[PDB]
Design a protein around this ligand. Structure first.
Ligand SMILES: CNc1cc(-c2cccc(Cl)c2Cl)nc(N)n1
Length: 154
């Protein structure tokens, strides 16, 4: 009962790229670049595609950094999110009708205007740790329960 998603963070030594989603699920929050994996696409090819479509950047190497399952109470389908990270990109970020990318200094990550789970796992991503997480949500603002652990292999 799970649907595959990817999420990609462009993380450089002193800054990270986030996008403000303007419409759809997650609108009004800053997040990485991501979406549903398509038929006939590998997860990693999905991640490259999402990044390229939503940010305008061309990515070279992608690195697996985590897997997070999200459950929304009342909704049958779980989100199975494969998280990736890259510091090897070409192009400049592009704002579109769907998404406004912005660079953030690592000391000014806008946690209060991100999904609340990011407060837990983003610091692990920043310190180059790999993780497996589960978050149970009620609606879009409230984490009822979660688990999060560091792993050697995603
Ligand atoms: C429910 N918590 C979430 C949900 C999501 C999310 C929402 C829409 C699309 C995609 Cl690909 C993702 Cl990963 N992202 C974060 N950081 N947290």
């Amino acid at each position: 009962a799970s649907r595959l998603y990817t999420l990609v963070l462009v993380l450089q030594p002193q800054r990270v790229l986030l996008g403000m989603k303007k419409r759809g699920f997650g609108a009004g929050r800053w997040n990485g670049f991501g979406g549903k994996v398509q038929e006939g696409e590998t997860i990693e090819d999905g991640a490259r595609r999402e990044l390229q479509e939503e940010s305008g950047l061309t990515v070279d190497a992608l690195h697996k950094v985590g897997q997070i399952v999200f459950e929304f109470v009342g909704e049958p389908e779980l989100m199975d999110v494969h998280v990736f990270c890259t510091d090897s990109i070409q192009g400049t970020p592009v704002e579109s009708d769907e998404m406004r990318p912005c660079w953030f200094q690592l000391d000014q990550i806008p946690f209060k205007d991100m999904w609340p789970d990011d407060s837990y796992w983003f610091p692990l991503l920043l310190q180059k740790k790999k993780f497996h997480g589960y978050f149970k949500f009620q609606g879009q603002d409230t984490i009822l329960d979660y688990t999060l652990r560091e792993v050697d292999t995603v």
